[PDB]
Every structure is written in structure tokens, then in C-alpha cells.
């Protein structure tokens, strides 16, 4: 807990092609998705 932005266990970083992707450490899988906002 420290503000909010990335889900628990998500790394935001660029791939070989140089695009910012996200990887979920929960299942351990790279998934290029844009995190939704629930407010």
C-alpha cells in the first residue's frame, strides 16, 4: 500500500519493440493492457 496505480505484482517496462508493457507476477505473465480506474 502506497497510493494506487499498478495492481499488486505488476511491472511497467518496455519490451524488445520498445513499448511500455505490463507483466503480472500473480500468474507470472506479460499482458499488454491499460489498467482501468474504479472510482
Amino acid at each position: 500500500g502506497s497510493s494506487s496505480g499498478l495492481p499488486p505484482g505488476w511491472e511497467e517496462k518496455q519490451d524488445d519493440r520498445g513499448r511500455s508493457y505490463y507483466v503480472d507476477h500473480n500468474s507470472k505473465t506479460t499482458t499488454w493492457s491499460k489498467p482501468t480506474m474504479q472510482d
Partner: peptide
């Protein structure tokens, strides 16, 4: 399949 299909490279390489 409990794991999501990876589209961009980097993780696990390929």
C-alpha cells in the same frame, strides 16, 4: 489455462 497469453516479448524471452 490460468496464465494470460503474452503478446509483447521480454518476459520469458520468447
Amino acid at each position: 489455462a490460468p496464465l494470460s497469453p503474452m503478446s509483447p516479448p521480454g518476459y520469458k524471452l520468447v
